[PDB]
């Protein structure tokens, strides 16, 4: 919708702010606001420049954020290499090759949850050894041979609708002391209904977990 509304729709807009760790140096980041969480509209999903990881920050009500300012810059909504190769891999497990500075190539098994909002050329991906929300343009790792999609028992798109969604829930965990790992489920992956986006307090990372309460 081109015409604006009194509420400021700050989703899909390049922003810029100062980050201050308590009694530390002030850093300057810019990035793209990807989404806003409906079960807590204070939270926005942000992708910083040069950073593959997606972060969840309560930008207006946070104290660590300084000089929040919206750039006149526009996100490059653009070309989709193939509408079919992307999503032929969504919901499938993959092995993503990453190489260290030494040159020693490694592999990380993970699953492609969805397609990124705002930057459509990017894919939502989470890894097993590191279960958080990352953003990579996989359409490139495949062409260069750094991404392998492997055969698995994944039927992809009661037969009738079930009330299954756990969005809006409240979670707590067995932290060894260290306060308590409290949080809230904020999203359900539309390709894998068992996989959920969780957002804990005292943390700005979007965790991608699989909730079934029993294997």
């Amino acid at each position: 919708s081109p015409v604006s509304q009194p509420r400021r729709n700050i989703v899909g807009c390049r922003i810029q702010h100062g980050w201050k760790e308590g009694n530390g140096p002030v850093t300057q980041w810019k990035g793209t606001v990807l989404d806003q969480v409906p079960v807590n509209p204070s939270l926005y999903l942000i992708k910083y420049d040069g950073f593959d990881c997606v972060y969840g920050l309560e930008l207006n009500k946070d104290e660590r954020v300084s000089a929040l300012e919206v750039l006149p810059d526009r996100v490059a909504t653009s070309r989709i290499s193939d509408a079919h190769l992307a999503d032929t891999m969504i919901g499938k497990a993959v092995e993503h090759m990453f190489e260290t500075e030494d040159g020693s190539k490694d592999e990380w098994r993970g699953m492609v949850l969805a397609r990124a909002p705002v930057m459509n050329t990017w894919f939502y991906i989470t890894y097993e050894k590191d279960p958080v929300l990352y953003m990579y343009q996989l359409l490139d790792d495949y062409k260069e041979g750094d991404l392998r999609i492997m055969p698995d028992s994944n039927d992809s798109p009661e037969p009738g609708e079930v009330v299954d969604s756990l969005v809006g829930k409240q979670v707590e965990y067995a932290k060894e002391d260290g306060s308590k790992r409290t949080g809230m489920v904020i999203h359900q992956v539309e390709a894998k209904p068992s996989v959920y986006f969780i957002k804990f307090d005292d943390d700005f990372h979007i965790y991608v977990y699989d909730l079934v309460k029993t294997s």
């Binding site: 980050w19 760790e21 530390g24 850093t27 980041w29 910083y48 040069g50 950073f51 593959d52 990881c53 972060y55 993503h96 090759m97 990453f98 190489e99 260290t100 500075e101 990352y134 990579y136 790792d141 260069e144 750094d146």
Partner: peptide
């Protein structure tokens, strides 16, 4: 060819 250094924000914390 991707790099884990890039992946997360270099300033940690």
């Amino acid at each position: 060819a991707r790099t884990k250094q890039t992946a997360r924000k270099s300033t940690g914390g």
